[PDB]
Amino acid sequence: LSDLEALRKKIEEVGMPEAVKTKALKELDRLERMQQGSPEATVARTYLDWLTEVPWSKADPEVLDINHTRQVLDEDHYGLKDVKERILEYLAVRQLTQGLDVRNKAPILVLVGPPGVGKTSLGRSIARSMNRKFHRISLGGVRDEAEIRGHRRTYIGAMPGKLIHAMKQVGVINPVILLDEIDKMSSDWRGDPASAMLEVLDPEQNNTFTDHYLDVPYDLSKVFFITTANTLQTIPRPLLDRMEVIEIPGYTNMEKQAIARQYLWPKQVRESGMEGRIEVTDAAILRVISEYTREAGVRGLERELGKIARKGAKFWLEGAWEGLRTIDASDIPTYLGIPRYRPDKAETEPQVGTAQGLAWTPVGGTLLTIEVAAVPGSGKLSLTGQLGEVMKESAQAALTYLRAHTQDYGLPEDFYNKVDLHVHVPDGATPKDGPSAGITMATAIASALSRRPARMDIAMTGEVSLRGKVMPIGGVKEKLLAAHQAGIHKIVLPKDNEAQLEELPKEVLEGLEIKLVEDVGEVLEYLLLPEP
Amino acid sequence: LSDLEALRKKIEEVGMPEAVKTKALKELDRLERMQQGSPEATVARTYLDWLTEVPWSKADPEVLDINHTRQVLDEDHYGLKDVKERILEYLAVRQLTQGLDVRNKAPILVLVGPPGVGKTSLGRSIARSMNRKFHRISLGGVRDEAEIRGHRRTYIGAMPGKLIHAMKQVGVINPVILLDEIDKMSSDWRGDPASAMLEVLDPEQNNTFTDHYLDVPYDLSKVFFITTANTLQTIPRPLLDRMEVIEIPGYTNMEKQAIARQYLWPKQVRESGMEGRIEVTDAAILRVISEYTREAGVRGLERELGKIARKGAKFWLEGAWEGLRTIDASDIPTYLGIPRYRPDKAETEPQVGTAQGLAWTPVGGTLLTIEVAAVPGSGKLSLTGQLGEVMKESAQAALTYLRAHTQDYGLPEDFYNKVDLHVHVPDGATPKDGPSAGITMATAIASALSRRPARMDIAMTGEVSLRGKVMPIGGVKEKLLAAHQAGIHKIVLPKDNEAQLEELPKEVLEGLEIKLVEDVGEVLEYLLLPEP
Ligand SMILES: Nc1ncnc2c1ncn2[C@@H]1O[C@H](COP(=O)(O)OP(=O)(O)O)[C@@H](O)[C@H]1O
């Protein structure tokens, strides 16, 4: 058949390394036989063709100016203005490398947070600065060690791997390969998939990687590696090491507006066809964020502005009555549709014994509207919502703290023998480890016992102390972003976290009011309209 | 067939016993047809890889010296002088035996200690001592009995256990193999992999060690073993015999400075790419240690010093401003984050109703900030923290002591019928079982009932009696080190442990000022000094 001759002519001209030349000889030996009566060799032909187009002795060196590299990364989907410094930190590390040559010998980089952020655009900016050919292969669709490796040409089911797929359509021997959804691979075949992942991620062992489908070494040392994380608590332990975690949660109103004005909306109208006949203002984006998408990231905003751009394209195609289409938070029902959420979510007829608190999930922050039913009984505790045991410990701690004050809060003679508690949480299984809303449901119980109207729009995070203290907590930036996105402008935090606030985005501080407390007494006094 | 030729020679020059030569020749016939002719060809090739690439009859020169190893322990590490002596004991015992004498009933080392306290480093120092190759193999994350061994050698697609590949890595029969994290071995399969590790970790049976993948009982008699274990409680009893425990608790603050100055700081400086143009004062080292790390050892220190090196890569890369830049304690947050830990615990401003306990949690030493409350009720004790009932017993013992000693603490003569005690313990459970914090709870309850603040700068440990007589407690060194790593240098100890003040090195008693007590009266005299 002409296939053998074509493959021989494709192999015999490309300059190839000796071991890979011998592997090409092996594959050419396989394809000696018929390629039409047995399709088990056609996939070998596809693998060879992907291997033929692998670049060799041709690479794009990075720009040696770290300052110019930062200048190029300044267009990485706007980043966060506080996460880019660690990226360019690793880049500067890559400017005084070990042995004065291109090699990692260290954790490379990672993006942790909600999937809606611009994970791919930042890697594209990295490639643009470094001049290498960007490419990505998603590992979320890979659940077995058979799509980064293969299945040797001796039985049916030898589909090509994703590694050579990235190696195929690339012009540089050292590309940047992005691996999204790294926290969903389980054990299905050939043991733990993370073992091969850590074998690849090694800067010295990647060159010594022999797949299930390959029998010779393959050059991967200089190839830059990059991954993306969604939930840090699900990634396998052999993947938590040799990995510099860069916390990149969602964006504020101002960050999202800048992304839309610089990266999102022009690209969306690129995807929708024509340009110069639509316009999106800051007020429209703010209203959409505050009324249509409360999640974290811009992918939902990507879809929304894509819908708006497609609509405007249809309006222009059906008749150009206006030079450009503008949205000013008044004609948005035609552009997008009926609103789904409620602006100012705290404006839900504030009841007597309910409080609101932050609970930053890795997919997006939420407000915990925990209600406490202080029915007059003889002392009971009904804890619903599937809440963790630490949440119950925090609840009992709040109970005894409220016990510590008899008549200060206008409480009755007793409630341990007179009040039955039925505490409900919108989702008790809080992904945030430890007590995330202990002070919140403490305030809820106090309101249910004092029986006075409570303040809304103040979302909280932290825990209580039996003598009236609050301890500092980690991940305050993510919860502050959750409050900013969820229409919350007042946040109560412990004093001890304030020293950590000098490394936060200025837009978060501008958009939020922070009133610090040291004791549960203050946070209880400032959340009920009357002190008693 | 070139592959068949290569496999045939690989059989030839490698010297296996004729019992294995029989298997080699019995697998020779399985390669009488090409790869696609039968999948048995691929599994035969894989088995030949697992057999004739694993070394046979090859041994590195064993070193049999015993003060040279003292130098090596001093060359690489700053010096333990407690663990080092016991390693000398084991090595000397191995030296006087292990010739032609079948006396190998000796236990295999287990280096029980928190993560990053000098175990793998100690392992590689030991390996260099006898000129043996080191291959860490982390067993953490293994729950399958057949992950240690192989599987059926009847189909292609399966790999042997960790041992076969791990010793395939080395080219000699006798490398040091540091088994790791043996405590997290769970049984999520048929039986417990504890026996699958006992068959290899005992010299009398692993000399004929058998795995599923291989059909020959391999000889592991000559292979040194050494096992890391963050926990001793969860080590299986079948794997607890023939075990000698070499405790390695955490380091000390001045030892931390010394290890940073001697090896850690130069290590990370050459790691980043810097070669002697950065100066770091000891004050900056201590600031890093006591403000940015609370883990026992150097792992956190390794990360922080890597951060220092990378920010130095910043501030020397863009120009050689200075020949030797000096970092004091003032500019350490210019290179790092905000100080996330306090300098010293003396600034705690003693709180009314809390006591500072001591324990050795197998992830690293830590305080037990046990807190309690005094609500006016009818008299009832409530444990909170999901600890054992033994802590409730200790609390009741302390309550009885106060009842018998009410004249000494100003309480009303009858409080057992008026106060309800909520003993909130922060952690879920403590490893150092029993009333290992009995005097801590005595202090906490005494402070709560009397409303007298307790000094939150003195870390303590010791049991109590129902009449009140503190008792000896095991692991006094553990409690002292846990107190030291909390920035605490004043410790209350039971006077019956006065014998446990000389066996400890002077490398631990630097700033710790032990104030021994024999009765609860003295330990409550040290703390409940203020009376507002
Ligand atoms: N004397 C020492 N004390 C503490 N750490 C040391 C010492 N010497 C070297 N180290 C470093 O500590 C690191 C941690 O190793 P080790 O604690 O032995 O293993 P693990 O981190 O698994 O407990 C090693 O990489 C080593 O470079």
Side-chain angles (χ1 to χ4, degrees):
Chain A
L1 273 78
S2 62
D3 292 326
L4 183 73
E5 304 167 357
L7 295 150
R8 181 174 61 181
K9 298 323 167 306
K10 187 62 196 56
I11 283 295
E12 282 186 350
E13 182 65 26
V14 180
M16 285 316 277
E18 290 300 326
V20 184
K21 182 71 78 180
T22 309
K23 99 174 185 186
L25 274 172
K26 287 193 268 309
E27 272 185 341
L28 181 63
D29 294 330
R30 176 72 174 91
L31 297 164
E32 277 207 357
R33 284 147 167 79
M34 295 298 102
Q35 299 195 11
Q36 64 178 358
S38 61
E40 306 193 5
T42 309
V43 75
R45 180 191 80 197
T46 306
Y47 212 80
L48 173 54
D49 297 336
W50 282 9
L51 283 169
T52 55
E53 289 171 347
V54 171
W56 283 110
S57 303
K58 285 175 60 64
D60 277 334
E62 77 293 329
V63 61
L64 275 297
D65 189 7
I66 183 68
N67 293 318
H68 186 273
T69 305
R70 180 186 66 88
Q71 288 293 323
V72 184
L73 276 296
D74 292 337
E75 295 184 359
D76 61 351
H77 206 71
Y78 189 62
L80 189 148
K81 286 296 163 68
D82 291 324
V83 305
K84 291 158 58 183
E85 290 81 3
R86 301 207 177 193
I87 312 161
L88 56 87
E89 186 186 15
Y90 169 75
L91 294 174
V93 174
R94 285 286 291 277
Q95 288 215 352
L96 289 174
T97 63
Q98 284 276 285
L100 305 172
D101 53 356
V102 180
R103 49 182 70 181
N104 292 314
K105 284 184 173 181
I108 44 172
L109 188 65
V110 75
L111 187 153
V112 65
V117 300
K119 61 181 82 64
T120 317
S121 305
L122 190 150
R124 280 185 285 256
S125 184
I126 297 169
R128 287 191 285 123
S129 66
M130 172 155 308
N131 292 109
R132 289 171 172 177
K133 301 299 296 303
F134 180 84
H135 186 259
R136 64 173 303 280
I137 58 171
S138 67
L139 271 294
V142 190
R143 324 291 320 299
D144 191 4
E145 277 166 335
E147 280 164 350
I148 68 162
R149 288 171 158 248
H151 283 274
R152 197 60 170 176
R153 49 192 186 263
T154 192
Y155 64 92
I156 185 67
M159 310 315 148
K162 283 187 175 177
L163 172 55
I164 313 298
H165 164 258
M167 295 298 102
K168 179 260 290 180
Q169 51 188 356
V170 63
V172 289
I173 72 171
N174 45 5
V176 171
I177 311 302
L178 182 60
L179 324 173
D180 298 337
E181 280 192 352
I182 208 71
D183 56 356
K184 277 202 289 182
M185 311 84 78
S186 65
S187 177
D188 205 2
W189 185 237
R190 297 159 183 270
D192 195 11
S195 61
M197 292 315 168
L198 199 57
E199 182 72 25
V200 164
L201 259 62
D202 285 331
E204 311 286 326
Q205 313 320 115
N206 45 5
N207 201 346
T208 74
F209 196 49
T210 61
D211 304 354
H212 305 320
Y213 194 81
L214 274 78
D215 287 335
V216 304
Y218 180 72
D219 200 78
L220 287 166
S221 288
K222 309 290 176 70
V223 180
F224 180 83
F225 292 163
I226 190 65
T227 66
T228 307
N230 184 37
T231 294
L232 73 165
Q233 303 170 358
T234 314
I235 316 168
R237 184 41 61 151
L239 295 187
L240 275 296
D241 63 358
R242 210 186 334 278
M243 201 36 48
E244 276 155 46
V245 160
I246 320 298
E247 187 184 13
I248 304 173
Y251 312 90
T252 61
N253 301 313
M254 291 65 88
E255 279 187 346
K256 280 162 180 288
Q257 282 180 359
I259 280 174
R261 290 181 289 110
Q262 298 303 113
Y263 314 92
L264 167 50
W265 175 66
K267 278 52 150 184
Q268 271 310 324
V269 304
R270 278 170 170 260
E271 294 178 354
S272 75
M274 73 291 291
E275 282 182 339
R277 285 94 177 94
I278 308 97
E279 175 61 35
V280 178
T281 52
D282 313 332
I285 309 157
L286 189 145
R287 253 77 184 206
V288 162
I289 294 159
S290 67
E291 290 170 354
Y292 294 88
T293 45
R294 295 288 189 178
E295 75 175 3
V298 298
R299 292 293 170 180
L301 201 59
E302 285 195 0
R303 286 177 282 278
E304 274 172 330
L305 294 174
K307 292 168 177 285
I308 296 167
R310 283 261 330 277
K311 285 288 280 290
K314 299 309 285 291
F315 293 105
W316 182 83
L317 196 67
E318 81 204 10
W321 58 78
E322 277 181 352
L324 299 89
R325 310 295 193 279
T326 52
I327 307 104
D328 288 330
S330 295
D331 47 357
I332 192 58
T334 300
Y335 285 106
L336 194 149
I338 309 302
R340 295 94 175 270
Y341 293 100
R342 300 184 314 274
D344 289 326
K345 291 185 287 183
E347 294 315 314
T348 178
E349 293 142 346
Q351 45 269 14
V352 182
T354 303
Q356 200 81 252
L358 285 169
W360 167 260
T361 76
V363 71
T366 183
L367 292 187
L368 284 181
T369 305
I370 289 174
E371 295 195 355
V372 175
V375 60
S378 287
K380 285 167 180 60
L381 187 63
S382 296
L383 301 175
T384 70
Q386 194 175 318
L387 73 164
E389 201 278 324
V390 292
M391 261 295 168
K392 318 166 186 181
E393 281 165 353
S394 61
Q396 190 50 273
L399 266 165
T400 184
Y401 172 75
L402 203 44
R403 291 191 81 171
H405 301 263
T406 48
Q407 290 285 109
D408 294 338
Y409 283 71
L411 309 186
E413 49 178 0
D414 62 340
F415 60 92
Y416 41 98
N417 290 318
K418 287 298 178 181
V419 160
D420 297 333
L421 292 185
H422 172 75
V423 170
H424 187 93
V425 187
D427 191 73
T430 62
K432 164 67 178 62
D433 302 356
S436 58
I439 61 172
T440 304
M441 65 180 288
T443 307
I445 296 169
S447 295
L449 190 47
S450 72
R451 293 182 186 87
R452 282 292 168 84
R455 278 185 57 186
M456 285 330 280
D457 193 73
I458 305 107
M460 282 145 188
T461 178
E463 61 272 12
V464 306
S465 295
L466 311 93
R467 198 58 87 183
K469 296 290 187 295
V470 287
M471 291 65 88
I473 55 175
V476 68
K477 173 158 62 185
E478 280 174 343
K479 310 170 144 161
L480 281 176
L481 293 175
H484 198 278
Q485 290 178 350
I488 294 296
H489 316 279
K490 316 282 198 296
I491 297 89
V492 173
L493 295 174
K495 314 173 41 193
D496 285 323
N497 296 281
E498 74 188 11
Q500 314 151 355
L501 268 70
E502 68 170 359
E503 306 98 313
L504 296 184
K506 194 42 201 163
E507 58 267 20
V508 188
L509 302 175
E510 278 192 354
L512 307 183
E513 299 200 3
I514 310 298
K515 36 188 298 179
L516 301 177
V517 299
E518 69 205 29
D519 310 332
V520 188
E522 274 197 352
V523 70
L524 277 190
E525 284 176 359
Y526 280 96
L527 270 292
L528 296 163
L529 277 296
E531 274 204 353
Chain B
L1 190 60
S2 302
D3 292 339
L4 174 62
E5 299 162 350
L7 294 165
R8 185 174 66 255
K9 271 75 72 177
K10 191 42 70 187
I11 296 163
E12 293 159 355
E13 71 285 325
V14 171
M16 61 295 298
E18 293 82 3
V20 194
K21 206 81 163 185
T22 56
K23 178 159 70 173
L25 276 296
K26 94 176 182 68
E27 297 308 320
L28 179 73
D29 61 1
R30 293 326 190 199
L31 270 189
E32 284 172 347
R33 73 280 192 190
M34 293 180 183
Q35 277 288 311
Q36 69 163 346
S38 176
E40 285 180 343
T42 300
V43 70
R45 187 201 74 191
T46 302
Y47 200 52
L48 294 174
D49 301 328
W50 291 121
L51 201 173
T52 61
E53 275 63 16
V54 172
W56 298 81
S57 300
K58 305 177 186 299
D60 54 0
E62 181 175 3
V63 181
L64 283 83
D65 200 344
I66 308 143
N67 54 327
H68 158 265
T69 187
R70 317 210 68 189
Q71 314 312 313
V72 169
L73 287 174
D74 201 13
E75 278 296 308
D76 297 15
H77 313 300
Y78 181 75
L80 294 172
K81 282 310 187 292
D82 293 331
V83 177
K84 313 221 286 181
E85 311 298 327
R86 304 151 81 141
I87 301 299
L88 271 295
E89 314 191 330
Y90 182 109
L91 284 170
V93 167
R94 188 176 182 84
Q95 159 57 33
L96 297 178
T97 57
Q98 278 85 16
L100 284 181
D101 45 351
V102 187
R103 323 289 192 267
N104 285 341
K105 269 76 58 182
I108 299 294
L109 291 161
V110 60
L111 280 82
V112 165
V117 303
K119 286 163 293 197
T120 69
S121 79
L122 209 48
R124 58 188 77 244
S125 302
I126 286 161
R128 284 201 323 108
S129 166
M130 301 76 88
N131 189 359
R132 307 197 200 189
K133 296 183 181 59
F134 184 92
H135 291 351
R136 169 175 161 98
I137 59 171
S138 170
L139 294 174
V142 165
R143 74 213 81 81
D144 186 75
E145 265 197 335
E147 272 158 336
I148 321 302
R149 301 156 289 222
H151 289 84
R152 39 203 167 106
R153 213 269 295 164
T154 193
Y155 76 99
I156 182 65
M159 301 325 188
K162 304 189 167 190
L163 264 293
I164 289 306
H165 200 313
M167 192 285 257
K168 188 205 193 86
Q169 282 192 354
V170 65
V172 298
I173 295 290
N174 49 1
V176 174
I177 307 312
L178 182 63
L179 294 174
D180 283 1
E181 206 180 277
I182 197 166
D183 64 330
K184 325 292 188 172
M185 291 325 88
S186 60
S187 176
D188 189 358
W189 207 246
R190 163 67 181 80
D192 191 358
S195 301
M197 293 180 183
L198 190 57
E199 65 183 1
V200 66
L201 203 58
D202 277 350
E204 80 288 340
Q205 43 192 291
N206 57 12
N207 52 5
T208 61
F209 176 74
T210 53
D211 67 343
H212 299 65
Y213 204 107
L214 277 296
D215 309 343
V216 164
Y218 209 101
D219 62 357
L220 264 69
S221 60
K222 291 296 187 189
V223 176
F224 189 98
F225 291 165
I226 173 168
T227 66
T228 314
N230 296 115
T231 300
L232 61 83
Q233 298 103 25
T234 76
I235 300 183
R237 192 47 208 177
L239 274 170
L240 264 182
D241 56 5
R242 305 262 76 80
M243 269 313 103
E244 83 174 19
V245 163
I246 301 299
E247 271 267 2
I248 310 184
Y251 294 97
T252 49
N253 280 327
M254 157 194 80
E255 266 174 343
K256 278 157 156 185
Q257 292 193 22
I259 181 59
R261 265 302 188 96
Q262 279 302 319
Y263 310 108
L264 275 186
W265 189 95
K267 266 184 256 212
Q268 49 86 15
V269 165
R270 271 63 72 80
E271 265 190 359
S272 85
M274 172 46 107
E275 284 83 13
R277 291 92 68 184
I278 284 299
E279 190 169 3
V280 163
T281 53
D282 287 307
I285 301 165
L286 182 62
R287 273 291 308 293
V288 167
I289 287 159
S290 82
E291 312 313 291
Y292 293 97
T293 45
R294 283 293 184 238
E295 60 92 10
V298 304
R299 180 72 84 192
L301 288 190
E302 270 289 9
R303 278 187 275 169
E304 302 280 335
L305 261 63
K307 292 215 303 172
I308 291 295
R310 297 182 292 119
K311 295 300 302 304
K314 253 83 181 193
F315 300 131
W316 186 89
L317 179 63
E318 296 172 352
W321 292 271
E322 304 285 299
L324 194 64
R325 299 95 165 273
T326 311
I327 296 90
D328 69 342
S330 172
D331 51 10
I332 194 67
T334 308
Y335 293 99
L336 302 185
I338 193 67
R340 42 189 289 169
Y341 300 115
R342 272 203 284 186
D344 279 335
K345 277 292 164 282
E347 313 155 348
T348 317
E349 207 63 31
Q351 179 68 349
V352 186
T354 308
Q356 270 174 353
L358 281 172
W360 198 254
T361 291
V363 301
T366 182
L367 299 191
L368 314 182
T369 317
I370 286 154
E371 198 168 11
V372 298
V375 61
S378 63
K380 63 184 72 174
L381 183 62
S382 295
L383 191 141
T384 291
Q386 308 301 326
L387 269 71
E389 202 79 9
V390 301
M391 311 276 198
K392 185 168 181 181
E393 293 179 353
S394 61
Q396 191 63 34
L399 265 173
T400 51
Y401 182 76
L402 276 296
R403 206 182 307 205
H405 284 61
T406 318
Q407 72 279 20
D408 280 338
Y409 299 90
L411 304 173
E413 314 315 308
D414 46 340
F415 56 80
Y416 44 72
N417 70 277
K418 284 190 282 181
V419 58
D420 294 332
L421 282 72
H422 182 287
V423 182
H424 176 194
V425 177
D427 47 348
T430 63
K432 183 64 177 66
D433 297 329
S436 49
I439 62 170
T440 300
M441 301 215 198
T443 295
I445 305 146
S447 298
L449 299 174
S450 48
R451 289 152 300 145
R452 307 284 84 85
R455 290 183 179 176
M456 311 215 67
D457 44 347
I458 309 170
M460 51 196 48
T461 174
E463 325 177 6
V464 285
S465 85
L466 277 296
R467 60 201 187 283
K469 271 169 189 176
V470 304
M471 282 275 287
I473 45 175
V476 189
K477 172 170 168 58
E478 301 296 329
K479 316 275 178 297
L480 275 190
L481 290 190
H484 188 193
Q485 294 187 16
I488 297 169
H489 298 86
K490 276 154 267 291
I491 294 92
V492 169
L493 276 194
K495 185 164 280 291
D496 299 329
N497 296 115
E498 65 183 1
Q500 280 98 11
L501 281 293
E502 277 77 5
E503 62 169 1
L504 300 82
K506 304 313 164 191
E507 307 167 350
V508 166
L509 296 174
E510 287 96 347
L512 315 180
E513 192 272 330
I514 294 93
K515 40 192 82 177
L516 299 152
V517 299
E518 46 171 58
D519 291 331
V520 182
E522 310 174 352
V523 65
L524 295 201
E525 186 274 333
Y526 292 167
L527 308 174
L528 188 153
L529 193 139
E531 283 178 346

Short mmCIF file of all heavy atoms in Angstrom, two decimals, chain B residues 63-80:
data_model
loop_
_atom_site.label_atom_id
_atom_site.label_comp_id
_atom_site.label_asym_id
_atom_site.label_seq_id
_atom_site.Cartn_x
_atom_site.Cartn_y
_atom_site.Cartn_z
N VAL B 63 30.68 -0.31 54.01
CA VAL B 63 31.60 0.34 54.93
C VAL B 63 31.27 -0.14 56.34
O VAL B 63 30.10 -0.21 56.73
CB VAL B 63 31.51 1.87 54.83
CG1 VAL B 63 32.50 2.53 55.78
CG2 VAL B 63 31.78 2.31 53.40
N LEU B 64 32.31 -0.46 57.10
CA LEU B 64 32.14 -1.09 58.40
C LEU B 64 32.83 -0.27 59.48
O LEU B 64 33.44 -0.83 60.39
CB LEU B 64 32.70 -2.51 58.38
CG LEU B 64 31.88 -3.62 57.72
CD1 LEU B 64 32.11 -3.63 56.21
CD2 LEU B 64 32.26 -4.97 58.31
N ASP B 65 32.72 1.05 59.39
CA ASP B 65 33.40 1.94 60.33
C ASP B 65 32.35 2.59 61.22
O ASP B 65 31.16 2.66 60.87
CB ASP B 65 34.24 2.99 59.59
CG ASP B 65 35.32 3.60 60.47
OD1 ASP B 65 35.23 3.44 61.71
OD2 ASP B 65 36.25 4.22 59.93
N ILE B 66 32.80 3.05 62.39
CA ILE B 66 31.87 3.36 63.48
C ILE B 66 32.13 4.71 64.13
O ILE B 66 31.24 5.24 64.82
CB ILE B 66 31.93 2.23 64.54
CG1 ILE B 66 31.73 0.89 63.83
CG2 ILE B 66 30.84 2.38 65.59
CD1 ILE B 66 32.54 -0.21 64.40
N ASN B 67 33.29 5.33 63.95
CA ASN B 67 33.45 6.74 64.27
C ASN B 67 33.36 7.61 63.03
O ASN B 67 32.98 8.79 63.12
CB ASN B 67 34.78 6.99 64.98
CG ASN B 67 35.96 6.45 64.20
OD1 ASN B 67 35.84 5.43 63.52
ND2 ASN B 67 37.10 7.13 64.28
N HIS B 68 33.70 7.04 61.87
CA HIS B 68 33.44 7.72 60.61
C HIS B 68 31.96 8.05 60.47
O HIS B 68 31.60 9.11 59.94
CB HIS B 68 33.90 6.84 59.45
CG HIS B 68 33.25 7.15 58.15
ND1 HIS B 68 32.14 6.48 57.69
CD2 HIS B 68 33.54 8.08 57.20
CE1 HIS B 68 31.78 6.97 56.51
NE2 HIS B 68 32.62 7.94 56.20
N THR B 69 31.08 7.17 60.95
CA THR B 69 29.66 7.48 60.94
C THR B 69 29.31 8.60 61.91
O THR B 69 28.39 9.37 61.65
CB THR B 69 28.84 6.23 61.23
OG1 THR B 69 27.45 6.50 61.05
CG2 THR B 69 29.07 5.74 62.63
N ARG B 70 30.04 8.72 63.02
CA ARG B 70 29.86 9.87 63.90
C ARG B 70 30.23 11.16 63.18
O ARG B 70 29.52 12.17 63.27
CB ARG B 70 30.69 9.71 65.17
CG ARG B 70 30.65 8.32 65.77
CD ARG B 70 30.82 8.36 67.27
NE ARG B 70 29.68 8.97 67.94
CZ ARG B 70 29.65 9.28 69.23
NH1 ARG B 70 30.68 9.04 70.02
NH2 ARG B 70 28.55 9.83 69.74
N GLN B 71 31.34 11.14 62.44
CA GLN B 71 31.71 12.30 61.64
C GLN B 71 30.63 12.62 60.61
O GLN B 71 30.26 13.79 60.43
CB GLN B 71 33.05 12.08 60.95
CG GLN B 71 34.13 11.51 61.85
CD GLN B 71 34.22 12.25 63.17
OE1 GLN B 71 34.23 13.48 63.21
NE2 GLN B 71 34.28 11.50 64.26
N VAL B 72 30.11 11.59 59.93
CA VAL B 72 29.09 11.81 58.92
C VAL B 72 27.84 12.42 59.53
O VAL B 72 27.25 13.35 58.98
CB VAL B 72 28.78 10.49 58.19
CG1 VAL B 72 27.54 10.64 57.33
CG2 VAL B 72 29.96 10.07 57.34
N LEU B 73 27.42 11.91 60.69
CA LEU B 73 26.29 12.50 61.40
C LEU B 73 26.59 13.94 61.81
O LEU B 73 25.67 14.76 61.91
CB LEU B 73 25.92 11.67 62.62
CG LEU B 73 25.22 10.33 62.38
CD1 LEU B 73 25.06 9.57 63.68
CD2 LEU B 73 23.87 10.56 61.74
N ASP B 74 27.86 14.25 62.07
CA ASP B 74 28.25 15.62 62.34
C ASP B 74 28.50 16.43 61.07
O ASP B 74 28.33 17.65 61.08
CB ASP B 74 29.52 15.65 63.20
CG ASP B 74 29.71 16.97 63.92
OD1 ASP B 74 28.75 17.77 63.96
OD2 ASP B 74 30.81 17.21 64.44
N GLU B 75 28.89 15.77 59.97
CA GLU B 75 29.16 16.49 58.73
C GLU B 75 27.88 17.05 58.12
O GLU B 75 27.82 18.23 57.75
CB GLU B 75 29.86 15.57 57.73
CG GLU B 75 31.36 15.45 57.93
CD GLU B 75 32.08 16.76 57.72
OE1 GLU B 75 31.88 17.39 56.66
OE2 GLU B 75 32.85 17.16 58.62
N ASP B 76 26.84 16.22 58.02
CA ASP B 76 25.61 16.63 57.34
C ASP B 76 24.65 17.37 58.26
O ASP B 76 24.05 18.37 57.86
CB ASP B 76 24.91 15.40 56.74
CG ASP B 76 25.75 14.71 55.69
OD1 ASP B 76 26.96 15.00 55.61
OD2 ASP B 76 25.19 13.89 54.93
N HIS B 77 24.49 16.89 59.49
CA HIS B 77 23.56 17.48 60.43
C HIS B 77 24.29 18.24 61.52
O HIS B 77 25.45 17.95 61.84
CB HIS B 77 22.67 16.40 61.05
CG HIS B 77 22.10 15.45 60.05
ND1 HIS B 77 21.28 15.86 59.02
CD2 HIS B 77 22.23 14.11 59.92
CE1 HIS B 77 20.93 14.81 58.30
NE2 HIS B 77 21.49 13.74 58.82
N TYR B 78 23.61 19.24 62.08
CA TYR B 78 24.20 20.01 63.17
C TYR B 78 24.50 19.14 64.38
O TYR B 78 25.45 19.42 65.12
CB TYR B 78 23.28 21.16 63.56
CG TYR B 78 23.86 22.02 64.67
CD1 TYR B 78 24.88 22.93 64.41
CD2 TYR B 78 23.37 21.93 65.96
CE1 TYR B 78 25.40 23.71 65.42
CE2 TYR B 78 23.88 22.72 66.98
CZ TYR B 78 24.90 23.60 66.70
OH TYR B 78 25.42 24.38 67.71
N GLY B 79 23.72 18.09 64.59
CA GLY B 79 23.99 17.18 65.68
C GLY B 79 22.83 17.03 66.64
O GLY B 79 22.32 18.02 67.17
N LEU B 80 22.40 15.79 66.86
CA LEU B 80 21.34 15.49 67.80
C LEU B 80 21.87 14.99 69.14
O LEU B 80 21.36 15.39 70.19
CB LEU B 80 20.39 14.45 67.20
CG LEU B 80 19.62 14.95 65.99
CD1 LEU B 80 18.85 13.84 65.32
CD2 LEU B 80 18.68 16.06 66.42
#
